Amino acid sequence: HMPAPHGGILQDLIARDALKKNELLSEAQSSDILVWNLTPRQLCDIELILNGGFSPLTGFLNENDYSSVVTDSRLADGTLWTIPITLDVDEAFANQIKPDTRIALFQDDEIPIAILTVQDVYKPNKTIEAEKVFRGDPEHPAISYLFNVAGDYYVGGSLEAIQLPQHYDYPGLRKTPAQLRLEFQSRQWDRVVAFQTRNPMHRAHRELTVRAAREANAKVLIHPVVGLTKPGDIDHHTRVRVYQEIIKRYPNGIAFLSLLPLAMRMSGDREAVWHAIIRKNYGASHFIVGRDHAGPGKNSKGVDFYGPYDAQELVESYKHELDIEVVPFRMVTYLPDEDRYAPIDQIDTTKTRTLNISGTELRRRLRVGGEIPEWFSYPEVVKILRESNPPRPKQGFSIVLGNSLTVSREQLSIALLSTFLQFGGGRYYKIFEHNNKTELLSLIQDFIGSGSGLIIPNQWEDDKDSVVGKQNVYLLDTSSSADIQLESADEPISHIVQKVVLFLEDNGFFVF
């Protein structure tokens, strides 16, 4: 039952180029070879290629495959493939390469990853890519990256592997497709259903998953993404701690945890098919496709990027060709009087109690510090989330003295500092003078991340608002754009202080 890789053969480049390692290593570490440092998304991508995770890929797509993928969701030879995997480069580097040029791809400017043999260098129409691949919405994460982070030139080419990107965390937890397939054989695991996730798992996830295992007669592979998920989500370290904990809530010998160095595009539809392909290469006969699978969410005008079922239908439409089975996850609700989750479909809310916790409410219960029902998520998991996302009483913040203020900045700072220290509780306070220095402005969010309260005497230049981070940063000024608005610019310091103290207290930072 274990699926053959996509395209019939596991492109384990690490294993195929084993004997030539030192040979490739040297060439890569020679001063005669042109060097290109891989960006974060590229590092995740290249790992899956050398890995065989992106079978049948063997390098970054050339214009021929890239175009076929963009317009037909297939490689030039017809193989289903929905996400363009290209090596984006800038004009400068582009002008130093031509077909057959040998490039060395490094990590952190010092670790030899692989040797790339160019065969194509083109300047893709990002308008068409954004439209045909990511549905053209300018706010879509992939399209934003496409235009502001991705180089404007793609470099098609074949790769020869030196070593997979270096990782120092979760060793042996990042099993390659070959290792996973071998692990499944050790356990005599025939049928395996894989679960995609870039989020923490709660009881519902544990139940829906065990259910899939039961109905599909397969074992469970919890395959969390730890490379790059949606921008601004929970760090993977925290998620992995949650996974390692929830894995213990499954009957013994039913589930296995393994991390996927994937860099998502949040391209729902196509991404789902891409996900099915990837797990297939990793050895899964079944793939769970959730509601709005890999969906960013809603845009500015509240419009959804993808339809709630777009992903499940797309994968379902290609499953026979992919030779995998799709396990659709229907929306579910909790029935208190039975202590069980059930498909919304079969519930008459008119004659049955139902409980549900939205992501917003959860984010709120972690901000406020309120209890989280044990039926929604396991105790151990909630504790883990509580540590990473502390309630406002344990959160850091920053109070910036507006430019409109005329009071003694030094005195107001001393006054605020002295005042905050009366409340105590654990938070460390500091009058922070940056002097419009980037080396110091870059530390603001670090102190806030540490729960520290910073009193900042002056504002920084607008051409640096990007160096800081708006999170928990409040402006004290007379302007209508301030978070703490003073009626005048020459108010008594005690007047000003009280306004700030009560503001913070109202926002939950101080508790008495």
Which residues fall in the annotated binding site for ATP? 196-199, 290-293, 332
**Stretch 458-497: interaction string toward a second copy, x if CB under 8 A:** ----------------------------------xxxx-x
User: Least Å distance between CB 148 and Na ion?
Assistant: 11
Residue 422 contact among a second copy, Na ion, none, beta carbon within 5 to 8 Å by kind: a second copy
Q: HSE-up of 363 (CA within 13 Å, CB side)?
A: 6
Task: List binders of a second copy among 424-463 (CB under 8 A).
Answer: 424-426, 428, 430, 435, 437, 439-440, 443, 446-447, 449-452
Counting contacts by CB under 8 A, is residue 253 touching a second copy? yes
Cβ-based nearer residue to Na ion, 17 or 88: 88
Exposed, middle or buried: residue 71 (CB in 10 Å: 0-12, 13-18, 19+)? exposed
Catalytically annotated residue among 198, 203, 279, 427: 198
Task: List binders of a second copy among 212-251 (CB under 8 A).
Answer: 213-214, 217, 219, 235, 237-238, 240-241, 248-251
Given 19, 31, 92, 168, the residue binding a second copy (CB under 8 A): 168
Residue 428 contact among a second copy, Na ion, none, beta carbon within 5 to 8 Å by kind: a second copy
Residue 418 contact among Na ion, a second copy, none, beta carbon within 5 to 8 Å by kind: a second copy
Given 77, 387, 465, 490, the residue binding a second copy (CB under 8 A): 387
Rounded-to-integer distance, Cα 62 and Cα 87, Å: 9
User: Least Å distance between CB 88 and a second copy?
Assistant: 23
Of 176, 354, 201, give the one whose Cα is nearest residue 281.
176
- Known active-site residue 86: no
User: Least Å distance between CB 5 and a second copy?
Assistant: 24
User: Least Å distance between CB 10 and a second copy?
Assistant: 25
- Known active-site residue 37: no
Residue 213 contact among a second copy, Na ion, none, beta carbon within 5 to 8 Å by kind: a second copy
Q: In degrees rounded to 5, what are phi and psi of residue 339? A: 50, 60
Instruction: Enumerate the H helices of 218-375 as residue ranges.
Output: 236-246, 268-281, 310-322, 359-368
* Beta-bridge partner residues of 221: 194, 256
The 10 Å CB-count burial string (b at 16+, else e) for 344-375 is eeeeeeeeeeeeebeeeebeebbeeeeebeeb
User: Least Å distance between CB 168 and a second copy?
Assistant: 4
Rounded-to-integer distance, Cα 25 and Cα 31, Å: 12
Nearest-5° Cα angle at 299, 295 to 302: 110
Task: List binders of a second copy among 182-201 (CB under 8 A).
Answer: 188, 190
Given 93, 122, 147, 423, the residue binding a second copy (CB under 8 A): 423
What's the chain's length in residues?
Answer: 512
Residue 25 contact among a second copy, Na ion, none, beta carbon within 5 to 8 Å by kind: none
Catalytically annotated residue among 62, 82, 197, 229: 197
Rounded-to-integer distance, Cα 274 and Cα 279, Å: 9
- Known active-site residue 199: yes
Residue 190 contact among a second copy, Na ion, none, beta carbon within 5 to 8 Å by kind: a second copy
Q: In degrees rounded to 5, what are phi and psi of residue 46? A: -65, -25
Task: List binders of a second copy among 90-119 (CB under 8 A).
Answer: 108, 110-111
Rounded-to-integer distance, Cα 478 and Cα 476, Å: 7
Cβ-based nearer residue to a second copy, 147 or 503: 503
User: Least Å distance between CB 109 and Na ion?
Assistant: 15
Structure tokens at 459: 């504002």
Helix, coil or strand: residue 287: strand
Cβ-based nearer residue to a second copy, 8 or 426: 426
Exposed, middle or buried: residue 393 (CB in 10 Å: 0-12, 13-18, 19+)? middle
Binding-site residue positions for sulfate: 196, 198, 294
Give residue for tokens 């209508």: 480
Structure tokens at 244: 């390692």
Rounded-to-integer distance, Cα 255 and Cα 208, Å: 13
User: Least Å distance between CB 505 and a second copy?
Assistant: 6
**Stretch 21-60: interaction string toward Na ion, x if CB under 5 A:** ------------------xxx-------------------
Catalytically annotated residue among 39, 199, 238, 478: 199
Cβ-based nearer residue to a second copy, 190 or 323: 190
* Beta-bridge partner residues of 332: 343
Helix, coil or strand: residue 143: helix
Rounded-to-integer distance, Cα 324 and Cα 282, Å: 12
> Is residue 354 a contact partner of residue 333, using CB atoms and an 8 Å limit?
yes
Rounded-to-integer distance, Cα 36 and Cα 116, Å: 10
By annotation, the residues acting in catalysis are: 197-199
Chain residues binding Na ion by CB under 5 A are 39-41
